[PDB]
Design an enzyme around this catalytic site. Structure first.
Site, short mmCIF file in Angstrom:
data_model
loop_
_atom_site.label_atom_id
_atom_site.label_comp_id
_atom_site.label_asym_id
_atom_site.label_seq_id
_atom_site.Cartn_x
_atom_site.Cartn_y
_atom_site.Cartn_z
N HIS A 43 -7.05 -0.95 1.75
CA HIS A 43 -6.53 0.29 1.16
C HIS A 43 -5.90 0.08 -0.20
O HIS A 43 -5.46 1.02 -0.84
CB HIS A 43 -5.51 0.92 2.12
CG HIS A 43 -6.12 1.34 3.41
ND1 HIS A 43 -7.02 2.38 3.51
CD2 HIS A 43 -5.99 0.83 4.66
CE1 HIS A 43 -7.41 2.50 4.76
NE2 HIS A 43 -6.80 1.57 5.48
N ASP A 75 -0.59 -6.53 4.65
CA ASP A 75 -0.96 -5.33 5.38
C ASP A 75 -1.97 -4.51 4.59
O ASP A 75 -1.95 -4.52 3.35
CB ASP A 75 0.30 -4.49 5.65
CG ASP A 75 0.05 -3.31 6.56
OD1 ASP A 75 -0.29 -3.51 7.74
OD2 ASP A 75 0.24 -2.17 6.12
N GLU A 97 -5.04 -8.47 5.82
CA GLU A 97 -5.51 -7.66 6.92
C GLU A 97 -6.52 -6.68 6.37
O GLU A 97 -6.16 -5.63 5.84
CB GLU A 97 -4.38 -6.88 7.61
CG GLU A 97 -4.88 -6.18 8.89
CD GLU A 97 -4.36 -4.75 9.05
OE1 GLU A 97 -3.64 -4.24 8.17
OE2 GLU A 97 -4.68 -4.12 10.09
N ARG A 139 1.15 -12.40 5.09
CA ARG A 139 0.11 -11.62 5.72
C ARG A 139 0.18 -10.27 5.02
O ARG A 139 1.20 -9.59 5.09
CB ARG A 139 0.40 -11.49 7.22
CG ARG A 139 -0.63 -10.67 8.02
CD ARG A 139 -0.34 -9.16 7.99
NE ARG A 139 -1.12 -8.44 8.99
CZ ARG A 139 -1.02 -7.14 9.22
NH1 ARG A 139 -0.17 -6.40 8.52
NH2 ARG A 139 -1.75 -6.58 10.17
N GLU A 160 -8.98 3.65 -0.77
CA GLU A 160 -7.97 3.05 -1.63
C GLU A 160 -6.96 4.05 -2.21
O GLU A 160 -5.83 3.69 -2.48
CB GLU A 160 -8.63 2.25 -2.76
CG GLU A 160 -9.32 0.97 -2.29
CD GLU A 160 -10.23 0.35 -3.34
OE1 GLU A 160 -10.09 0.68 -4.54
OE2 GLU A 160 -11.10 -0.47 -2.96
N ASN A 162 0.81 -1.22 0.00
CA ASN A 162 0.00 0.00 0.00
C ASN A 162 0.84 1.27 0.00
O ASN A 162 0.46 2.25 -0.61
CB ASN A 162 -0.95 0.03 1.21
CG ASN A 162 -1.88 1.23 1.20
OD1 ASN A 162 -2.75 1.37 0.33
ND2 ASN A 162 -1.73 2.10 2.19
#
Ligand SMILES: *[C@@H]1O[C@H](CO)[C@@H](O)[C@H](O)[C@H]1NC(C)=O
Ligand SMILES: OC[C@H]1O[C@H](O)[C@H](O)[C@@H](O)[C@@H]1O
Ligand SMILES: [Ca+2]
Length: 470
Positions: free
Chosen positions: A208, A204, A228, A202, A160, A120
């Protein structure tokens, strides 16, 4: 490793900086309020894998591994979420030799390595306006980032496309939907997974990132990824499983904590969200079940009650999905927020006598013995066989988990669980107390709970080789 290979796993989450040091010190200070590197590392983690395996965990999810920024004036990037260079490692945690030694040693123990990854954003020790984009690698131009704005949480495209933060420290938001950025992210992770023999990821800040970018990233990685997705509504979070193999079970988390933080709580919202997740998510058994993480208050910050913590942990481990325990949870760490919830684990002395250490060990052990005993156990859906205001009975194949939020001062209560699937007369053992009873008509189980303790039943005959109850 595939989603299917991840089904029977259970995960111990660590903040690398806060778990264990290579030099073996259980007394190096870690003033959580200082927000500095406390010195935890890969060689430290390797050194305390017996501690982790002692609780029955078989996977570790470690902090993001990528190189961070250097300037710590506004806090050190000890948590790994403020990266500047995808192609280099954060050397506070170790060199590529150290990390390769971690993967090797996890794999020698039959364990899985799960890596936290951020696509992100990068981090910058200054506000949005101060960012020198040329310092990032590989995305070394403002061209690869959305323009800075704060998120309007009523707008999904803002969620986003705007930045998580624009003040110091800024989180410049990558154009994950841009073909070149997506390509580079995908080639990066395909390579990183090979390079370090990563078993799962995983991801993050998944909500977003645009969904197609998540999809092709998970594909490129070629391993199970859990997203997540930070949202309590199954109607929001569950549709993400069309794009990532799993998501963290935030929708179950919120009512779980509400149920077990106090005897004043009620089970009904937990029941409702469980039903909703089962109606909405493609596969609830590929979700990550948790009751703590580094972003939210420690369970013990809500309540000191040991029986309540035993009930949340029983749920965490024994419910459908892949269990996740946040390092410190087993020592009843009580930090009520970031940075207080990032206590150094070494400061507890890796105490294997802690009651929640032994409790987790038993829960993990019966779950794993149940996997061993029956090929179909892990893919069998949990049914709620009983609920009232204060009690929940979960049946997953031959494992019956009976929970209560009545707490440590409860005294004594009896609940009758209908249709467990045990045969009338079949002897079962509560593996937590080593007390033994039998099922009655139609699989009926008469369960007495005392002092708020959970009970976990397994057929007594099938218990051999367990290590449980002699
Ligand atoms: C980013 O890196 C490329 C490759 O070295 C270089 O040509 C370009 O000038 C860099 N962009 C900036 C803004 O420094
Ligand atoms: O650290 C807190 C953060 O947790 C996550 O990474 C969430 O995706 C994000 O929405 C939230 O700000
Ligand atoms: Ca974004």
């Amino acid at each position: 490793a595939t989603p299917d290979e991840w089904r029977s796993r259970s995960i111990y989450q660590v903040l690398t900086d806060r778990f264990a040091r290579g030099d073996g010190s259980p007394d190096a200070p870690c003033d959580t309020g200082a927000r500095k590197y406390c010195g935890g590392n890969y060689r430290g983690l390797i050194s305390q894998l017996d501690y982790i395996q002692g609780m029955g965990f078989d996977s570790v999810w470690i902090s993001p591994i990528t190189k961070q920024f250097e300037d710590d004036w506004n806090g050190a990037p000890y948590h790994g979420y403020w990266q500047t260079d995808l192609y280099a490692l954060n050397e506070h945690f170790g060199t590529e030799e150290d990390l390769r030694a971690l993967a090797d040693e996890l794999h020698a123990r039959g364990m899985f390595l799960m890596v936290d990854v951020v696509i992100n954003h990068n981090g910058w020790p200054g506000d949005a306006a101060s960012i020198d984009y040329s310092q990032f690698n590989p995305f070394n131009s403002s061209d690869y980032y959305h323009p800075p704005c704060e998120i309007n949480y009523d707008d999904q495209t803002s969620v986003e496309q705007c930045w998580l933060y624009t003040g110091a420290n800024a989180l410049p938001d990558l154009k994950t939907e841009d073909p070149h950025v997506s390509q580079v992210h995908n080639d990066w992770i395909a390579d990183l997974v090979s390079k370090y023999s990563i078993d799962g990821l995983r991801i993050d800040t998944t909500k977003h990132v645009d969904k197609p970018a998540i999809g092709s990233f998970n594909d490129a990685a070629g391993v199970y990824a859990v997203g997540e997705v930070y949202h309590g509504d199954p109607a929001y979070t569950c549709p993400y499983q069309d794009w990532v193999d799993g998501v963290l079970n935030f929708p179950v988390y919120y009512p779980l904590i509400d149920a077990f933080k106090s005897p004043s709580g009620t089970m009904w919202s937990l029941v409702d969200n469980i039903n909703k997740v089962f109606q909405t998510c493609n596969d609830p058994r590929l979700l990550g079940t948790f009751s703590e993480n580094h972003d939210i208050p420690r369970f013990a910050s809500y309540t000191q009650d040991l029986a309540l913590a035993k009930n949340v942990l029983a749920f965490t481990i024994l419910f459908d999905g892949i269990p996740i325990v946040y390092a410190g949870q087993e020592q009843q760490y009580s930090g009520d927020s970031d940075p207080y919830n990032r206590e150094a684990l070494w400061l507890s002395g890796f105490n294997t006598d802690a009651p929640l250490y032994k409790h987790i060990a038993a829960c993990n052990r019966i779950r794993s013995h149940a996997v061993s005993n029956d090929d179909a156990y892990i893919t069998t859906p949990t049914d709620i066989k009983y609920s009232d205001d204060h009690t929940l009975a979960l049946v997953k194949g031959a494992v019956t988990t009976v929970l209560t939020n009545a707490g440590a001062n409860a005294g004594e209560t009896t609940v009758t669980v209908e249709a467990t699937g045990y045969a009338s007369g079949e002897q079962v053992t509560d593996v937590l107390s080593c007390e033994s009873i039998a099922a009655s008509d139609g699989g009926r189980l008469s369960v007495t709970l005392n002092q708020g303790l959970p009970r976990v039943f397994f057929p007594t005959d099938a218990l051999a080789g367990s290590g449980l109850c002699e």
